[PDB]
Write a protein that binds this ligand. Structure first.
Ligand code: A1H6K
Ligand code: A1H6K
Ligand code: A1H6K
Ligand code: A1H6K
Lengths: 133, 132, 132, 132, 132, 133, 132, 132, 132, 133, 133, 132, 130, 130
C-alpha cells in the first residue's frame, strides 16, 4: 500500500508548488502547519518560521507575477515513516523567461516534510538549497 | 518536550560519530536507504551510505586535528511517536592547512524514523559550507 | 520565565517603534544617555538619542515601502532584578529600487536597566548589515 | 564612580588572559553560561566557553609574538550594585610573520555580573576585526 | 550505406520539426519515454517531452525570425536493423535581438529505435551552446 | 526479461568505467568497438574516433594514477532497443583528492551506446558533457 | 602572367558582390559545392552556399553604409590553365553606428576553377576578423 | 575515389613530417615558392620554406615530449587533373609544463599542384591555435 | 574644568557656522592668519580663510539639506589662560543625491587662542573624509 | 622676542624628530607630556595616548633600525599663543630604503602642539596624516 | 643652396598638411605621386597605397569636419639626398575638441619622403606612428 | 629594376648586422647623421648611431641565440640615381627565455642615399614591436 | 627684496589672466618666443603662444564658472637685476561638470626676463595634471 | 651664440656627474641653496643638496651598470650675460634588474646663474618618472 500512498504525498506536494507558483497564499496557509520551519537561500542561512517569512514574497511578488513559468520535480524520492508522516526530496527545475523574453532555467534541491494532522497532510518543514527562485 | 530532548541526544551521537570518523557507529544509526542533499553532491540526491564512505576512508578517521561540532538552537518537529525532524545551524571549528583555528557554518535538516524502539536516520539535507 | 518574557516584550516594543518611525515611544524606552555600537556609526560609540534621531526625521516619508522585521532566538542574561541583557539575530525583508525583495541580517545586543520600575534601554551593539 | 575603575581593571585582566592564552583564568572570570557575538562565530550567538576553548588550545604558534591591547575611551553603565556594562574600542598592536608592526580595531561590548565576591563575565559582543 | 541515408533523413525531419516549432510532428517521431541531456536541463536527465513543451510554447512557434539548422558530417552507428545512433555537429544560424545573423554550435547525439517500421526517438544528448 | 537484461547493461558499463579509472587500456580496447565515436570536453566539440584519441590519456595519465578516486553512476536510465543494442544515460559523480589532499567532487553527464556483436556487448558511441575529469 | 590579372579582377567582382549584397551574382561565380572555413562558422567547414545565403538575406540594415575593400599584395598560384589559387590580406574600411571610420583586417585564401568559359569559386578560407 | 585518396595520402605524409621534425621530406613535398597563412606569421603571408625551417631547427630536441595529431573529415576539391585542394580540422594532443595533457584545434587548407607527376604543396592556410 | 566646556562650545559654534554656510560668522571666529591641513588641500598647509571661502560661496551657503554633526569624545589640552587644543572624531550625518542618510568620519585638531576677549581659531588639521 | 620663541620651538621640535629617528624612547618620554594625545594613520582614526601607543613602535621597529633615513621638514609654520604655548605645522618628507635597498619617498603632514611647563617645552598633542611611518 | 632646398621641403610639406587638415582631397592628389605608399595606424600594420586608402577618410571624415584643430610640427629634421629627393621627419602635435567639446592633445611621429618629378615636388611615401588620426 | 635589388640587399645587410651585433659594420652602412623614429625612442627623433650603440654593446653583441629576420613584400621608391626609400613589414623569429619560438612584427621605413660609391642609411622609422 | 615682491606681483597677474581667459593680457606679459613644458603638451617643449591660444579660444575665455588659484610658498631666484625664476605649488579650486567644488595641484616654474622696462615671461614648466 | 654652447657644455657636465654618481663634482656646479621640483619629491619644492645626496650615497655613486643619457634638442634662453635657462627632453638608456636595456623619458628645466666667474645651478624642474 506504499506505491499509492507515495502518490498521495506526490499529489499534495505538487499542489503546494502550484500554490507557490500562482501566489495563492490562502491555500498555502491551509496546507502548511502554522509552525512550519524553513531553510532557504532567501533566509541567509537562518531557520525561519515558514508562514510569516514567506507572506512577504506572496504579497509583493508571487501574487503579482503573470509570466509563464514551468516547474519540474525530477525523480522525487519519498520516505514513508509510518502512516502519519512523510519526507519527500527532489530536484526542482524551473523554466522561465527573463525581462528580455529569452528562456532561462534554474535548479534547486528541496526537502519537504509532511505530517498527517486530522487526516490532512500538513507541511511542517522545508529545506531548499541552490537558486533562490 | 522530554521527547524533544531524546531527538537532540541521538542526533548529537550521529554528529559525534562523524567527528570521530566512526563509520561503523554511523551505519548502525542510518537506514540502509537513506538519501542526502549536500554541497559535496553538487545538487544531486545521493545514497548517503555509498557517497559518504569516501569521506570516512580519506578524511575524518585519522583525527590528526581536533574538531568541534556545535548544534545551535535545534528545532525539532515531532510527527507522532515514530517520526521526528530536526533542523539546526551546524558550527564546525577546525584547523586549516596552517594549523590555524577556523569556523564554518552549514544548515542541516535530518529526518529520523523509530523502528522497533531504535531511531534510524532516513534523510539529510545540508546546505552552506561545501567541505565538512 | 515571565521575568525573561518581560525583557523580550519591552525589547520588541522598541524594535516596532524603529520600523514605524515612532521616535516618541523610542525615547520613553531609552535612557537619555544610552550608547550604541552600529555600522552607521563607523566603528564609534555614539551617545544619546541624537545620532539616531536623524534617521527617524529623514526616513519617515518613505514608509510607503513595505518592510517586515523578524527576531530570531533571543537569549536573555539576568544579573539580579534591575538588570538584563538580550541578544538575537535581526532579519529584515525589504524592496530595492527595482521592486525586488531582499533580506538583510544583523546581530543585536541590547542592555536594559530598571530605574523607577520602568525598563530603560541603556546600551546597544549591532553588527552586520546597515539598517535598510 | 570608583566601581567603574573596578570594572576597567577586571576587564583588562580578562583581555590580558586572552592575550597570554591563560584559559583557566579566562574560565575563572567568565560565567559558565556566557553567550557571544563575534566575527569568528559567523553572525551566530554561541555558548561562550565551549566555542572559545578551541582557540586557546590551538593558537600555540603565536605566544612568541608581542602584542599590546588598548581600550579606547571605555564607557561604563552601572546597573545597580551587582551588574555593569562596559563598551570600548579595542586597538591591538602586533607583529606579523614578516615582522612588520600592525594595528587592528574592533568594537567590544562586555556585560559583567558581581557573583559572590568576584565579577563574572556573562555576555560579549565584538564587531570589526577577528581576534584571530 | 543506403541504410545510413535513411537515418540522416529522419533526423533532419526531427530537426526541421524543431525549427518550425511543430510540436505535434515532434511528438509523433519521439518515444513517449524519451530522455534528454541538454544545457537547458542544467546537467540533469529529463523526460524530453515534458521539458521541451516550454520551448515550443514560448520560443520557436511564431517563427518571427528565419532560422537555419545544419548537420555537419553526421556519423551513424547501425546496431542491426532496428537501432541506430547518429552524432553530428549542429550549426544554427539565427537573428539576435538586434536582428543580426549569428551562429551557435552544439554537439548532438540522438538514438533511434525502429518499432513496426517507424523510427522512434528514444534518447538525445546535446552539449555546447546553452540556448537552442 | 528486461529488469535483468538492464542489469546486464549496468554491469558491462560499470566494468568499462572501472577500466578507465584504473587505466587498463587493454580491457578498454576489448570492450569498445574499433570504430567507436566520442563527444567529450577534451575533444573541443569535435566527434573523434574513441580508441585512438583516448589512448593518449591512458598511456600518459590514467595508467600512472595511484590516487584514491570514487565514481558513482547516479540513477542510470537504460533504453533497450531490441535484443542487440542498448543506450544507458547517467550522471557520473567523481570523488577525488587534490594535490593538497582535500576532498573534491566533479560531475559529468554520460551517454553510452552498446551493441551486442558476437554475443559480447561492445561500446560503440559515447557523449560526455560537464567536467573533463 | 596576364591570367593572374584575370584572377585579380574576377576575385574583386566576388568581393564587391558580397559588399553590395548581390547574392545572385555571388551564386553565379561560386561552384554550388564550395566549402568554407570562416570565423562565423566557429572552426567548422561548411557547405558554402547554404550557410552564406543566411547573411545576404538578413544583413539589410547595412546597405546604407559606405565600405571600401582593399586586397593587399595578392599572391596568385596558377595550377595549369583551369585552376588558380589566390591569397591576400583583406582590409575593410567602414563606418560604425556612431559614424566613426574603422578598419578591419582578415586573411583570405580563395581557390578558383575555370568552368566552361567562366571562373568558378570552389573553396575559401578566411581568418581574422568576422565579415559581420 | 582513389584520385581523392591520393591527395589525402600525400597531405598526411606532410603532416607526419611536421610532427617528427623531418625537414627533408617536408621540402620534397613542398614547392620551393609555397605560401602560408598561419597564426605564427601574425596575419602575414610568408613565402618559401624559410619561415618554417626555424621551427624544425629549434624544436627538434624536445621530441621527448609525446604528441598525437588527429585529422578530421578532410574535404577535397578537384579542379581538373593537376590541381586539388584539401581542408580539415587538425586536433593536437600534447603535455604542458605540469605534465597534464591538453588538446588544441586548428583548421587547415592545403593546395596541391601536379608538376612532374609529383604532387607539390603550393599554399596553406591555418587558423586557430598555434602549433604547440 | 569650565575652560574645557568653553573651548568645547566655541568649537561647536565654528562647526555649526560651517554647516549652515555662514562665512561671516566663520570669519569672526578665525584668526586672519589661520592655517589648515585637510584632505581638500592635497597635503599642503593653506591659509584657512582664503582657501575655505570657495567652499562657503559655492557649496555650503546654498545647502538646504539637513546635516547633523557629532563631536565624539573631545579631548582638550589647556595651555595657560589664552591657549587651548581640542581633538575629536567628527561624525557628519547627511543625505546623498539619492536622499539616503550617510555617515562620514574625520579626525580634527583645532587650536584656539583667546586674544583680548574672544577665542580665535588659529590652526586646524583634518584627516579622514574629504568633506565637501 | 617672538622670533626668539619660534627659533626655540623649531629647535625643540627638531630634537623630538631626532629622538624618533634614532629610536631613543627615553629622550622621547622626557620631551613629551605624560598625557599627550595623538592622531596618526597607525591609530586607525582614533585618538590615542601618545606615549603608551608609541612604545610598541620604539621597542619593535625604530630603536633597532639602522637603515639610512633622511627626514625633511618643509615650510614649517609656527603659531605662538601667548608665552607658554606654541603649535608647529609642516610637511615631512622621509627618504628611506625598502627591502630591495632602493630609495623611496613618503610624505606626511604633521601638527605638533607644545606647552611650556616649568622651564621645559612639553609635547602635548600631535596630528599626522599621510603615510603610515 | 642646401638651405634653400630645405625651406622648400618645409613649405611643400606644410601645404600637404594644410590640405589634409581642411579635407581638400583634390589638392592632396596633386601633391602626391599616384603610387605613394603609407604606413599608418589605421592600416593595421600593412603598407597601403596612400591615395586609394585615404580617399575614404577625406570623403567621410576630414572634408566635412569644421571643428577647431591646431597642428604643431615639432623639430622637423630634413635629409637632402642629391637634388631631386628629400625626407622630412617631425613630431606632430594635434589639438582638437572631442564630443564633449573639451580640448585634447594627440601626438604622432611622421616621416614623409618627397621626389622632385619634373618641376614639382611629389609625396612618394609616408610613415606615421602614434595616435590614429 | 636592378637598383631595387641593390637597395633590397644593402638593407638586408644592415638587418643582418643588427642581428649579429656587429656595430662596426652597422656604422659603415649608416650616415653619421642618421635619424630614427622607433618604439625604444618613446616618440622622439634620435640620432641613430649614438642611441643604438647602447643596444649593440649590452644586448645584441652578446646574443648567441638563433634569430631569423624576414622582409615581407618590400616596396622600393627610387628617386633619381642616388636616393631610395624602402618600406617593408619586418618579421623577427626568436626564442624567448623559455626557449620557445616567438614571432614579432614591426613596420620599417629606411631611406638610403648613395654618397660617392657606397649606399648610406640616412633615416629610419619603425612602428610596431619594441624590439630590444 | 623689493624685486622678489615685484616678481610675485607680475606672476599673479599672469595667473589671473589665465583664470579669466584674457588672452590679450596674456600676450602682453609673454615673450613671443616663450617655451613651455606642460602635461597638455605630452612631454614636448612647445614654442610660442599658438599652443596656449587654443585653450583660451575654446575654454578659458568663455568660462564663467568661479575659479580660485593659490600660489603656495613661492621661491624666487634673482639672477642679477634683469632676470628671475619663481617656483611654487599651484592649488586650483574649481567646479566639475556636476558643479561640485574640486581641487587640483600642480608645480610650476616660471622664468622672467626684464627687457627694456617690462618683465617678459620666457619659459614655464608645469607638472601634474592637464 | 658662444654663450648657448657654453650652457650646453656645463649642463652636460652636470648630467654626466649624475650618471656617474660623482657628488663632489655635483656640489661644485650647484648653488648650495638650489631648489628642485622632481617626481621623487612628491610634488614639493626641495631646497639644497641634502635631498639629492641621499640618492648619490645609496645608489648613483655605487652604480657600475652602463647608463647613457641623451639631451634632445635643448632650448636655451639667455637673460643677459649672467643667467640662462635650458630646457630639453632627457632620454635615459639603462639596464633593469634583469639586465635588459630599457628607456625612460623626462623633461628637464635647469636655470643657471654666473656668479663671479663660475656658472652655478640654481633651480631645476623635472617631470616624468622617478
Ligand atoms: O536600532 C537602534 O536602536 C538604532 C537605530 C534606529 N534606526 N532607525 C532607522 C530608521 C528609523 C525610522 C525610519 Cl522611518 C527609517 C529608518 C535607521 C537606523 C537606525 N538605527
Ligand atoms: O580583537 C581585536 O582587537 C582585533 C585583533 C586582530 N588581531 N590579529 C592578531 C594577529 C593576526 C595575525 C597574526 Cl600573524 C598575528 C596576530 C592578534 C590579535 C588580534 N586582535
Ligand atoms: O572580412 C573582412 O575584411 C573583415 C570585416 C569586418 N567587417 N565589419 C563590418 C561592419 C561591422 C559592424 C558594423 Cl556596425 C558595420 C560594418 C563590415 C565588413 C567587414 N569586413
Ligand atoms: O604546417 C605547416 O606546414 C607549417 C608549420 C610547420 N611547423 N612545424 C612546427 C614544428 C616542427 C618541428 C618540430 Cl620538431 C616542432 C614544431 C611548428 C610550426 C609549424 N608550422
Amino acid at each position: 500500500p506504499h506505491m499509492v500512498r507515495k502518490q498521495e504525498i506526490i499529489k499534495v506536494n505538487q499542489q503546494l508548488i502550484e500554490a507557490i507558483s500562482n501566489g495563492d497564499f490562502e491555500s498555502y496557509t491551509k496546507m502548511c502547519d502554522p509552525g512550519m520551519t524553513a531553510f532557504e537561500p532567501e533566509a541567509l542561512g537562518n531557520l525561519v518560521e515558514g508562514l510569516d517569512f514567506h507572506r512577504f514574497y506572496f504579497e509583493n511578488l508571487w501574487s503579482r507575477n503573470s509570466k509563464p513559468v514551468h516547474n519540474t520535480m525530477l525523480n522525487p524520492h519519498i520516505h514513508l515513516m509510518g502512516d502519519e508522516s512523510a519526507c519527500i526530496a527532489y530536484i526542482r527545475i524551473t523554466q522561465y523567461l527573463d525581462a528580455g523574453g529569452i528562456p532561462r532555467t534554474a535548479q534547486s534541491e528541496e526537502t519537504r516534510v509532511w505530517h498527517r494532522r486530522d487526516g490532512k497532510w500538513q507541511h511542517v518543514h522545508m529545506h531548499r538549497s541552490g537558486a533562490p527562485s
